[PDB]
Design a protein around this ligand. Structure first.
Ligand SMILES: FC(F)(F)c1cc(-c2ccncc2)[nH]n1
Ligand SMILES: [Cl-]
Ligand code: NA
Ligand code: NA
Lengths: 306, 306
């Protein structure tokens, strides 16, 4: 029993973290096969950041301008190029610890583990969701750029996030490993803001199912509803629309717990309209939306990643 | 910015997890140098649950009764001995992945990371705290016994918990790595129940300091309190006593934020009286008690956001 915000074991990714220095700027890089990936803004001075021309800034750099340290061992950079907003540093040795991996771009609502890193050295791991407004509510300090986010699907590490910047509200923005930003953000020191966020409805439902599985049942009721009725309520309370595909995905959990999705939706409707009346669910006084249906199934079944 | 429940990177512990089988029972072992540590109750049978005599059960075992699998590899058991409630299996291979490590017994309120494992293979990582009633609120399924809790200071892993059992309330009990149980529990299936749990006051205070460091001041007030009046109030809310040790411990956070410890105590008293009135603190609608003063300093900036 029990249900905790759980990250993937981070060992396979720790073996890929390196330190990248260019001029006075040090940040983190991801070392896979013979390439080190890091944010292209590593080449900018402070005034460069105000309005960077990245191709122009890069041509002035030689390979020896990029100092890369894997542990206490230096790596020899033998080539460099840009792909969208990530710099690719070709090195002279393949990473002997390279895991089985893919680069994948995730959808808002999906979760991933972040390996927070400083000076190429992993410092912590935590679980995040890509918010509907394409930010993440991370925890990062200066020096954390180039830290990465990932899932493990069977034995393959799926890399989905590289950290680039913090927005004025304290939430965070970055790219996939092909350098495409999540959200309408640019890697430049200019005025940028998180858009208004919404709650991930299918994840809240998944977490209610997790609650029921763990004996927390007070919010269940006799009522059911319809998609169109419930989605009217969701829109009123700034919840994402629930689609038929979400209902299908929650299917397993509906049959296991005996609570149909629209039955559970009636529970969520009543919670949104009346609150919790002093009670908690899985130890929380707010409705939690950073567990996907797959997260709930996996934690409540013990899937492993050796 | 940001503030998240953050675990240590697990890789150094992942490289130590093995599977231990005895009879029909399989669970996890921790492989360090040439010793594998696991719960002694792996040698119990179905009729041994209530009043096992471990000394009598163990004397009947030979080294080849213990099967230890590390990855795809059988390790050879060349010796065994029992220390309190843990079994130490001597094996014919030192673990080449053994980190710098030590064994530390922790006090209630301390936090640590848990690497949940099944069949010797890691499933997930999360953060826990040793409750005042000597249980932990974990996420553990059948087969998770032998999973460990740890901190990582510099590059050194301090092992502080090994999981032995789940109590009827769904919380968890276990030992240090010397096999001594936390709290009054025993590795028997006789009726035992956790004491009434209380809130870790010094940790709530730490987390309020984290909220100020990250720029939130809404809950402060113009008042202060004596230590004794605070404790008289807080105990009525099932909060642990705050000692002068705790006040001393909070000195650094107090100095960083400019809020005297006893002034922060006055804020907490008011929060217990008023609730949050629809507001949140670091994203929670409840007061969080599983961040220590040491945790806050490690995760937060050294510069307060005024
Ligand atoms: F044997 C049972 F009854 F199937 C079983 C035991 C556990 C468990 C849960 C958490 N920690 C340790 C063990 N789950 N289920
Ligand atoms: Cl109805
Ligand atoms: Na219902
Ligand atoms: Na293993």
């Amino acid at each position: 029993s029990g249900f905790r915000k759980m990250a993937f074991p981070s060992g396979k990714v720790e073996g890929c973290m390196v330190q990248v220095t260019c001029g006075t700027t040090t940040l983190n890089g991801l070392w896979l096969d013979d390439v080190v990936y890091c944010p292209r803004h590593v080449i900018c001075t402070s005034e460069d950041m105000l309005n960077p021309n990245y191709e122009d800034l890069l041509i002035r750099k030689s390979n020896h301008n990029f100092l890369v340290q894997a542990g206490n061992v230096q790596l020899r950079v033998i080539g460099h190029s840009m792909q969208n907003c990530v710099l690719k540093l070709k090195v002279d040795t393949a990473n002997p610890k390279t895991p089985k991996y893919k680069f994948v771009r995730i959808q808002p609502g999906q979760t991933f583990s972040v390996l927070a890193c400083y000076n190429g050295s992993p410092s912590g791991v935590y679980q995040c969701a890509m918010r509907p407004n394409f930010t993440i509510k991370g925890s990062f300090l200066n020096g954390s750029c180039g830290s990465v986010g990932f899932n493990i699907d069977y034995d393959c590490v799926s890399f989905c996030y590289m950290h680039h910047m913090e927005l004025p509200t304290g939430v965070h923005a970055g790219t996939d490993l092909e350098g495409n930003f999540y959200g309408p953000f640019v890697d430049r020191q200019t005025a940028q803001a998180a858009g208004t966020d919404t709650t991930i409805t299918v994840n809240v439902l998944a977490w209610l199912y997790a609650a029921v599985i763990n004996g927390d049942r007070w919010f269940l009721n006799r009522f059911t509803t319809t998609l169109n009725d419930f989605n009217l309520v969701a829109m009123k309370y700034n919840y994402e629309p629930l689609t038929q595909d979400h209902v299908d995905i929650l299917g397993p959990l509906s049959a296991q717990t005996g609570i149909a999705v629209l039955d559970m939706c009636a529970s969520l409707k009543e919670l949104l309209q009346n609150g919790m009346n002093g009670r908690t669910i899985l130890g929380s006084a707010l409705l939690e939306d950073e567990f996907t249906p797959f997260d709930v199934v996996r934690q409540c079944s013990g899937v492993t990643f050796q």
